Design a protein around this ligand. Structure first.
Ligand code: HEM
Ligand code: HEM
Ligand code: HEM
Ligand code: HEM
Lengths: 141, 146, 141, 146
């Protein structure tokens, strides 16, 4: 349901992120753990404190996977096929937690890119994250 | 939670007919079949491949009695659910790492199992009362998550 | 997504419904209004007393829409096209309410189908009602 | 709602720098642009077809100002949100017919607006304190829904 305008808004905004994607990934995660304590149940083996290198490394993996989706916005099911299988048959994260991360990801972008975060781009990003989350949970059952 | 005197009598009347061990193993069984990702905690149980192996798994029945027994004893204290399940909440959070959303899926499955076993006796008003309880129980167990 | 086995199950269970489709749809609505009262905010123009003609009449349209969906399970978007436009551009029901209605439908089928409501059929019906909801809310934005 | 001494201090400090007239106008507008189905409650507001039209609508600006103003008055009573918003809760339910889920969507959009305006100032801990507040205000308004 992503129109041409949406895709343009996504590339534009994510293009301005560039190299800072890894730092933004780790910030979104940190915001989620504090604001939504339940999501911590999926990382009992991590040192979930401020500045934790483990969280920074995971934040980079998430951010790169998103960079991968933006590059294949017209063919996301196949570009995330491996990730879909991993979260569906190994990790098993309940679907509700993807919306919690998406929100925190929007808050981070808004706090770092003020002039780029227009109410229209905001609309496109939210639809983009919802589409990323649909593909990542598409094989749960 | 806040149930009128007639709603409580409704909840207590139907539960007396329930075979706690039977329904227990059937509610957890369908939880693992309908929502497969809940199986992440039960890898040490054995064969969880097909719907039949899950419903006939002895370890799945064993846990189901344990879960439904705690729930059952909980109905004797509906006016103090957070006080009754304060310790289980800490355990499920700090030691078991169970996402509270699992408590809401099981509660819904428990309501569908009650509709199946009781049929037309599980009237709309009766369901209305049991929903408030599966929600009240789910909230009390998720109260100590930090 | 719906597997071939899922489709067989939904068609088998719905085949057992048959003529009672309209009556079950009415009971599914009554159960929803009582358990989840926030749904009544979408029916201020309805007499919501037990057995009112309006709830019985709506129950039948909801049943007919489900039957067409099952008869066209291999192509629900084209079958539910007009109805999805209606919920997207006019009715504008928040997506969270589609799960409350599906649950109440499952409870109803479970209370009237003792022999057909097996664990494998319970699952396939929950996926089927999830799919119908997604298609009915696919044009919201 | 319960906030630690540091959280209560964070929420109060940041809310002193907020221009309620402008922040509320931004919040209501983004709710109609990002989640278009919420436009059902404001058919008598005029042009809402495009984003620039929604944000430039004077009736959208005026209503966001009243809503956030009422939200502001509740911040001074974090200890009893239920008793404070009791009247408004009954109004949004009996006469306005607003599905309570809309209060939750606005709460999240408001968090995205506070982040946009303040940048680095809106740190993770500050945001955690604000998620708690908007969740509590949303529940207090959906409290008298019968
Ligand atoms: C925007 C959605 C998401 C994206 C793009 C994403 C991406 C990824 C990636 C790239 C990996 C690493 C794969 C590898 O090991 O090679 C992964 C692992 C993981 N994800 Fe996700 N994920 C998403 C949402 C979630 C959510 C919401 C949770 C949990 C609350 C979650 C929990 C995990 C966990 C537990 C790991 C394993 C970490 C470890 O111990 O190495 N993911 N995810
Ligand atoms: C209404 C809800 C539930 C109640 C009343 C409840 C009750 C219990 C009880 C009594 C125990 C035993 C703890 C002990 O011996 O110290 C327990 C253990 C446990 N619970 Fe729950 N629980 C509930 C729901 C869940 C759900 C939905 C899951 C997961 C999908 C879950 C997973 C576990 C696990 C993995 C254990 C440990 C089993 C073992 O080590 O034998 N619980 N729970
Ligand atoms: C299983 C999912 C659903 C299906 C198949 C469905 C189907 C329909 C159908 C067949 C109509 C009749 C339209 C016509 O006159 O041609 C309709 C109307 C309507 N639907 Fe849905 N619907 C569903 C879920 C929802 C939910 C969850 C709600 C919200 C509480 C809802 C609220 C309405 C309302 C307000 C109307 C108009 C009633 C009237 O004025 O007569 N629908 N729907
Ligand atoms: C934090 C949440 C909210 C607060 C504190 C709030 C507060 C208020 C207040 C004080 C009024 C003025 C009553 C009057 O003058 O008659 C009002 C009216 C109204 N509210 Fe809310 N509100 C909230 C959320 C919402 C949301 C999110 C929506 C809708 C998407 C909404 C829709 C309405 C409508 C439609 C009116 C009537 C406008 C008119 O008459 O043109 N409110 N609200």
């Amino acid at each position: 349901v992503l129109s041409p305008a949406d895709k343009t808004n996504v590339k534009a905004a994510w293009g301005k992120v560039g190299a800072h994607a890894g730092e933004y990934g780790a910030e979104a995660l940190e915001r989620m753990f504090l604001s939504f304590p339940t999501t911590k149940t999926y990382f009992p083996h991590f040192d979930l404190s401020h500045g934790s290198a483990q969280v920074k490394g995971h934040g980079k993996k998430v951010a790169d996977a998103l960079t991968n989706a933006v590059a294949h916005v017209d063919d996301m099911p196949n570009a995330l096929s491996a990730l879909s299988d991993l979260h569906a048959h190994k990790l098993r994260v309940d679907p509700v937690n993807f919306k919690l991360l998406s929100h925190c990801l929007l808050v981070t972008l808004a706090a770092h890119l003020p002039a780029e975060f227009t109410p229209a781009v905001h609309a496109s990003l939210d639809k983009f994250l919802a589409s990323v989350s649909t593909v990542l949970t598409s094989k749960y059952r | 939670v806040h149930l009128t005197p007639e709603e409580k009598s409704a909840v207590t009347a139907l539960w007396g007919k329930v075979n706690v061990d039977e329904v227990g193993g059937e509610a957890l069984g369908r939880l693992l079949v309908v929502y497969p990702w809940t199986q992440r905690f039960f890898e040490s149980f054995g064969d969880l491949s097909t719907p039949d192996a899950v419903m006939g798994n002895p370890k799945v029945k064993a846990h189901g009695k344990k879960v439904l027994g705690a729930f059952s004893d909980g109905l004797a204290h509906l006016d103090n659910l957070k006080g009754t399940f304060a310790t289980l909440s800490e355990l499920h959070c700090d030691k078991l790492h169970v996402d509270p959303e699992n408590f809401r899926l099981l509660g819904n499955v428990l309501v569908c199992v009650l509709a199946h076993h009781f049929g037309k006796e599980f009237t709309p008003p009766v369901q209305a009362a049991y929903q408030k309880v599966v929600a009240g129980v789910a909230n009390a167990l998720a109260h100590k998550y930090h």
